[PDB]
Structures are given as C-alpha cells and as structure tokens.
Structure 1
Amino acid sequence: AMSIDKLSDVVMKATEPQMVLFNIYDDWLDRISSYTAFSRLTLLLRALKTNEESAKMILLSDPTITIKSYHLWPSFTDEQWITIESQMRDLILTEYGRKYNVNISALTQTEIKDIILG
C-alpha cells in the first residue's frame, strides 16, 4: 500500500499520530460488485508489491487519464480496466519466470492461477 502516490504523501508528511480515512475503491462500486472490486484491488497490489516501478508504468502510461483529486487510482473506463487487469496479470507471470527461471509454458493452468493468487 505504501507504494501508492497519495498514501505515501500522507504518511510521510503527517507530523502527529492521527487517523485518516480513504476510499480504496475510488468510485468503482457504481459499476462493480464488492467481490470483483476487492479482486482487482488485490491484483493491483500484487503487481505493485512485486515489480513496483514497472507496474506503476502500466498505471501511469497515458497521462490523458487523470487521477482525480479525491481518488487514488486513475479513472479508467470499464474496458481499460479489463486490459490493465491483464497487463498487471502479466507482470506476475513474467516476474515469476524471472525469479525461478521457469519458462512459463512449462506450468499447468492451475499453477498459473495459483501464481496469480499466491
């Protein structure tokens, strides 16, 4: 979580012990159930946990898409999320292949889903 722009900006500056609310889902719960929202969220954290900078490249590619002043995550449409979940999905696999030096066509499908989900 600390690898996000906003949250680091708040936790670095604040000089007192304090509580701060955020809404992690921005406004995603208009068009998305809590289930799939939590699911995408954990995918956006797992790709930020591992690669970091190269995930943040996937998020911040197009500057035309802007993070609002309220939200954390940049405001996409539904389809842009459907592709970005696939890229953020890809970093976990390419990185896994880099780490254990396993060419990833050697894995069973279950092994892929497990890799993506831990």
Structure 2
Amino acid sequence: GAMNSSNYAELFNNDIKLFVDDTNVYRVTVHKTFEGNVATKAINGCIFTLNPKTGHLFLKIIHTSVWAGQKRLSQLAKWKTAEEVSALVRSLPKEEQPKQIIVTRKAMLDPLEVHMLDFPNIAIRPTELRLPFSAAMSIDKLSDVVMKATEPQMVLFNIYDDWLDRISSYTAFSRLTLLLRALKTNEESAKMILLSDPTITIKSYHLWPSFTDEQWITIESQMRDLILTEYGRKYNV
C-alpha cells in the first residue's frame, strides 16, 4: 500500500527496499527556433534508485540517444524507468533483491508493476511523502557524471558517505532529505552553506563534506533556516 508518516520506521527495518524516483529521467531545454516556433532539446538524465537503509544509490544514467526517434517521451520515460529497475532487480542475487519498491510518483505504479510481473512477491507501493529526490542533480558529483556520459551507464554511490558509522539510517535519511530539500528550495544558498568553509573538504570518494558531529548540527540548523527563510520570502510571511 501507500507509504506515509505512520509506517515511517518501516523504511529502516530489515526488509530490503528501494525508492525509485523518475523525475530526472527525461530532461529537456526549451528554446525558440529560427522560424520562431519552440523546440525542445533533450539532455542526459538519470534514474534515482536508493536503498534508504544502506545508502546505496544505483544511479542509471539515461543517455539522450534512448529518445532518438521515439514519440510521447514523457510516457516512454516512465516505461524506460520501469524497464531499467526491473533489469537491475534481475541482475541482483536473490538474497539482494528488494521485497518492496516505493515509487515517488504514482504514474510509475503501472509501468513498474507490469515490468515486474515475473516478481509477484515484490510489492510496488506509492508514498504520501513529498521527497526531494529531484534535487539529486544539485549534487555536483552526480550532475557531473550524468552530463559527461556518452553512453548508457550505471554509477554506484553511497549517498550517506560514511555517516552510518556514527548515526542510524533513520537519522541519515533525515539528514539527506533536509539537504536535498534545501538544495531544491534555494540551491545557491544551500551550496554556500555546504562549501563556505575551505578548511572542510569532500573526500575523493564522497559526495558531501567531512563534517564533524558538531559541524553537522550547525549545518543542519543553517539548512532549516534556509528553508524557513525561503518559505517567508515566498508567502510574504
């Protein structure tokens, strides 16, 4: 069924599960043509497939060649997403396959259910959470590898860096969603917050800076202020 704020702890139990977000699969720029019409130009996208307990991110890069000569691309993108998630599940050993897949957008339910007919024991669920996974393209290292891709490619990341050494996956997911919500609400200011201090760096094998426990509290507080600030700017509050 639908995943929400009542059964929130289910995300961090021992049943393997993946979130799938398709909001960056089909990406375009819109521009005027010489004749004054409007044309779109696709750019590389990505499927965001995340194990919320472990932080493992299966970033499938969607190269613009997959759209070549296809029609109704927004619809195709949901089915291409479902096709790639299904192939990912099939490539995993049985004991690593998820027991549930949670789609962030309800329009993915039927495409994924149909591609996963061979897996009748894997539950495909929507969620009532509004998750900021679209902002994944605001993470520099992920945006880089997507835009440099010359062919389809799967890149693997731990989106929690080494946080699980010190915090629970409940807390790490909460830190992630607050970071992504801030990047989505005011990307420039969020990045200012994250990288204003040169003394704090990002390890080559990480996505985020190497903050101490106390620095993460400061950073998290600054992200909450950014969100509140933007909320007041928006609504004149």
The bucket for the TM-score relative to the shorter chain is 0.7 to 0.9
- Structure with the greater relative contact order (CA < 8 A, sep ≥ 6): 1 or 2? 1
1:3 aligns with 2:143: no
CA offsets 1:56-82 (integer angstroms, 9 cap, x no match): 000001111110100000001000001
Cα offset, 1:18, TM superposition:
1.2
SS at match of 1:97: helix
SS at match of 1:49: helix
Q: Which runs of 5+ in 1 are unaligned?
A: 103-118
Cα offset, 1:35, TM superposition:
0.2
CA separation in 2, counterparts of 1:65 and 1:55? 15
**Equivalent residue number for residue 179 of structure 2:** 44
Q: Which runs of 5+ in 2 are unaligned?
A: 1-135
Q: TM-score, normalised by structure 1?
A: 0.85
CA offsets 1:10-47 (integer angstroms, 9 cap, x no match): 00101111111001000000000000000000000000
1:92 aligns with 2:210: no
**Equivalent residue number for residue 207 of structure 2:** 72
Q: TM-score, normalised by structure 2?
A: 0.43
Cα offset, 1:100, TM superposition:
0.4
**Equivalent residue number for residue 118 of structure 2:** none
Percent identity, aligned pairs only? 100
CA separation in 2, counterparts of 1:18 and 1:10? 9
Cα offset, 1:4, TM superposition:
1.0
CA offsets 1:58-113 (integer angstroms, 9 cap, x no match): 000111111010000000100000111000010110100000001xxxxxxxxxxx
RMSD: 0.5
SS at match of 1:22: strand
**Equivalent residue number for residue 198 of structure 2:** 63
Q: How many residues align?
A: 102
SS at match of 2:226: helix
Structure 1 or 2: more helix by fraction: 1
